[model samples]
Target chain A: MKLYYTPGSCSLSPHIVLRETGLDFSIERIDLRTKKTESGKDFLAINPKGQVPVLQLDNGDILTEGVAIVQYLADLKPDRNLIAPPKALERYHQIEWLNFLASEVHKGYSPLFSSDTPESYLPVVKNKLKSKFVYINDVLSKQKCVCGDHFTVADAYLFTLSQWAPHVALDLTDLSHLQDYLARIAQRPNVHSALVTEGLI
Target chain B: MKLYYTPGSCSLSPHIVLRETGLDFSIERIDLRTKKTESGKDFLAINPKGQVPVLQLDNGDILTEGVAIVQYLADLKPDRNLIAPPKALERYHQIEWLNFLASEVHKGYSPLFSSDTPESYLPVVKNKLKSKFVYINDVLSKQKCVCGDHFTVADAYLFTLSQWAPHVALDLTDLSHLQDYLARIAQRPNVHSALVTEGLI
Candidate 1:
């Protein structure tokens, strides 16, 4: 499989899942502004939405969306248990976390990430992200991970977004549990390796 | 199952799915600003996130997130076949559409919906939403639904969000295919009744 990615983008969540599942995969980088892949092909041809985290299967079918990509990779190696099987209600709730992080947390960072976003909107966007961090800290304070003690794709996803708090100037000092949660996820060998390979570390 | 929803919110998609599956279920309306149900109970107690479309199973297990909720309901009655099964590669692609609508199309409307949003930003937000509508029109022009020929949970979701185009002053008049698709989805018995039940039509 080939995972089209941008360095430290949301693709990092699925990139970590690739290593965690011990899957044989290759990654190609995309220049977002140029819309060109490292291979010098138009990125929009792969996903006209022109986003990273497009997964190309051996059959050549492609899939986009980071949350969907993580779930697909996790289901591929259920023994690795990156995510629980679909029939399990636990899996449903875990996916709830994924959806929450995607829309509420991840999308809130758009203003900070894109140079096209106006400077005046930065405070409003950062406050939204910070509020979600408060919610994340509240949830993590009671459980070892988002779903419970065991780590799932939810934890991996939230960990990726939480890493961007400082980049947007959202202070995490008061959210001790989230601070600890980020540190704990960073310690996993697969997580560490994914970060290093992407030059995030 | 019991679904906690807010009339015409994102919850409308799952509300439509609940009807689509012919599931025996009940629903309660939520007041987002008050954080209470129509019956005046604290909604925050049911979902700490204070969002709607929280499905409570008969077994007392709870699930949040409309995308996950629709998938759960669809899988419950595969004969209805609202979505492809998890093991199928088609299901992963279907979910990619769900995640795209949620993060890109759905969340893009947040700024327009919030009274607190700056008035000066309306043009920027509307332009973003209009561009996405163009993309959606392109995808739907060739396919009957977001994923393919049959109506899936993805269509229910996009259908729900598309209804909001006029609310934000983002015109869909030029997107003839999307307009036709919206009308077809609206004519379905399930979608019609769900809208009526929510007092949205």
Candidate 2:
């Protein structure tokens, strides 16, 4: 399988999962603005959305969306338990966290990165993002990971998003549990490799 | 199962799914502002996120997130085919649509509804949302549903968020395909019943 990605984008979540699952995968970098892959292929022709984290399966089907791509990769090696088995109660719970991070925490940063976003609205966006982190910190206080004690795709996703906090100047230092959780996730070899490969480390 | 929902919110997606899947379930209305259920239960206590679209299993487990809830409900009655079966490549594609709607379409409306959002930022938000719908229109122009010819959870979610356009004065009438698709979804018996039950129609 081949994964088209932009370094340190949300694509990092699936990159981490690909390594964690020990999947035989190769990564191709993309220029987001140019919409071109490193090999000079038009990325928009591959995935119309022109977004990173596009996973091309062995059969040539393409999957976009970090939430979907991570799940697809995890399911490929379910024995690794990167995500819960299908139809298990735990599976849906895992998906719940994926959606939460996608819609709430991930999208929360969109405005801050937008060039046209009003200067006055930056505080509102950051405050909402901080509140979400606080809620997540409270959740992490009792559990070692978002789903439970074991790491899963949710952790990879959370780790990828949390890395952006410092870049946006959205301080999460006060959320100690979340900070600790991020620290632990970063120690995972797969996650560390993904970051180093992305030049994020 | 009991679905805790706020009328006409994203919860409506799962509510429509519950009806479409022909699942035996009860609906409990939630007041988002007060974070209270119609039964006077503290919603925040039930789901710390304090968001609607919480589905409580008969076994008493709680499921949050419309994306997760719809998939869970659909899988329960797979014969109804509200979503594709797990492990199918099509299943991941279905999820791709769900995540797109959740992050790009659903959360796209958050800033517009926030009380503190700068007046100047509304245009940026609306333009982004409109572009998303334009893309959806292009897709829907070629297919009957977001994923394919058959209706699925993605349609329910797209319909739910599309309903918010008018509330925020975001015009989508120019997107004839999307407008037509929304009309088709609204005509479904289950969707009609859910809307009526929620006092939306």
Candidate 3:
């Protein structure tokens, strides 16, 4: 399998899980600004959206969407419990968290990331992101990870987004529970490996 | 089961699906303006986000989030196949569509619906929503539904959103495929029943 990634992007979550699963895979870096891969392939040919974290299976099937890609990889090694089994109710909770992160938390930071976004909308976006963080912090305060004590795919996702907090000029200083959650996940060997591979560390 | 809904809201998707599945459910209206139920109960207690489509399960658990609630209901009658069995790869695709609608299509319409949204943001939001509609139209043009021949949960969602296109002044006349798709789904017995129940007919 091969994963196309952009450094420090949400792709980091899947990249981390791949290492955690002990999967043999290759990586290709996409330069988002130029829409070109490290090997000079047009990124659009790989993903119509021209985004990173497109996982190409050995059979050449391409899976886009970070949440889907990570879940697919985790399912490959169900015994690892990186994600709950497909039939488990906990799996639905995992999906719920992934959806919340993508729709509410991840997209909420769009205005802060896009240069074209209006300055007037920054506060609105930031406020929305903060409210999501409060909920996340409260959830994490009572549990070791988003689901429970064991780290799951959701944690990897949260870690990826939390890594972006500093770059987006959002402070996690006041979110002590979330801050601790970030630190704990950062210490995971696979997470460290993935970050190093992406040169994000 | 009791479904908390606001007329013409995304909750309508699940409402339609319940009818489609022949599940017994009662509707409780929520007033978006006051964030209260028709019975004068605080809506926030049901869903912290204060959104519609909270389904009270037979087990007495309240499920929030439209996608989650719809999937949970569909899972109840696996033989009905309203959605693919949980954990199917197709399930991820279904979720991708749901997340896309929520973050991209549904929230994208927020500015158009809100009086407080800045005038400058309207064009941006409109363009984004139009791009999404174009994508949905293209997908519908290729397949009978978002996930293919079988009408699944994603179609219920897309159908519900397309119903709002006219209200938002979205020009779907050019998206003929989507128009046809909408008309066909509207003729489904369950859809007609749902519409009548909601007084949308």
Which residue pairs collide in model 2, if any?
none
| Candidates in order, interface RMSD in Å | 1.3, 0.6, 2.0
How do the residues B94-124 of candidate 3 rate in per-residue lDDT, one tens digit apiece? Answer: 7667777877787777668877677887777
Q: How displaced is residue A16 in candidate 2, in Å?
A: 0.9
Q: For each model, chain A TM-score?
A: 0.96, 0.98, 0.97
DockQ list for all candidates? 0.77, 0.93, 0.49
Error of 1 at B112 (Å): 0.1
Error of 1 at A98 (Å): 0.6
**What's the TM-score of every candidate structure?**
0.97, 0.98, 0.94
Model 2: residues with Cα > 4 Å off, grouped in runs:
none
Cα lDDT, all candidates: 0.89, 0.91, 0.83
Quote the positional error of residue B192 for candidate 2 in Å: 1.1
Q: Across residues B38-127, which tens digit of lDDT does each residue of candidate 1 receive?
A: 999999889988888899999998898898899899989999879987779999888888898989999999989887676777888889
**Best candidate according to lDDT:** 2
Clash count list over all predictions? 0, 0, 0
